[PDB]
Design a protein around this nucleic acid. Structure first.
Ligand SMILES: [Cl-]
Ligand SMILES: [Cl-]
Ligand SMILES: [Cl-]
Ligand SMILES: [Mg+2]
Ligand SMILES: [Mg+2]
Ligand SMILES: [Rb+]
Ligand SMILES: [Rb+]
Ligand SMILES: [Rb+]
Ligand SMILES: [Rb+]
Length: 136
RNA sequence: ACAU
DNA sequence: CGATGT
């Protein structure tokens, strides 16, 4: 209904899908960029959205912050809830890095706790999430 | 259909 | 127009 302004917003950006993937997290209220991942040569939109949420969880936990996380990705929200990224991307030498990061993010979820609410950013009502890359 |  | 996902 209403935006929770005291939150972290995350989003993926890419060049192609599959293609070069990056992600970032921003303060929803101010747009300040709080973290940005260096581009990964091949990944999917959904793998990047998943990594962005998990990085957000780790970032907030390290800082003892109870803020929620907004994501626009129905898929990634579910994958984090399930602790399992059900990507179709081929596992081969070209995709080794993205898959290593996804495997490591799942591993973190299976070995740590968090209370962070993971909320759907309601793009249809609110416009683009504040972490968006402005590329579409 | 919906979400990217 | 193409892709990734539930
Ligand atoms: Cl990562
Ligand atoms: Cl909340
Ligand atoms: Cl959702
Ligand atoms: Mg997104
Ligand atoms: Mg975006
Ligand atoms: Rb802590
Ligand atoms: Rb975009
Ligand atoms: Rb979107
Ligand atoms: Rb589809």
């Amino acid at each position: 209904e209403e935006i929770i302004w005291e939150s972290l917003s995350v989003d993926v950006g890419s060049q192609g899908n599959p293609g070069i993937v990056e992600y970032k997290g921003v303060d929803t209220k101010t747009g300040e960029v709080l973290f940005e991942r260096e581009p990964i040569p091949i990944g999917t939109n959904n793998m990047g959205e998943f990594l962005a949420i998990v990085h957000g969880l780790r970032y907030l936990k390290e800082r003892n912050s109870r803020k929620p996380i907004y994501s626009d990705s129905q898929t990634a929200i579910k994958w984090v809830k399930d602790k399992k990224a059900k990507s179709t991307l081929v596992r081969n030498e070209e995709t080794a890095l993205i898959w290593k990061l996804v495997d490591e993010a799942e591993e973190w979820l299976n070995t740590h706790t968090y209370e962070t609410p993971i909320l759907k950013w309601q793009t249809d009502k609110w416009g683009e999430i504040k972490a968006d890359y402005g590329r579409k």
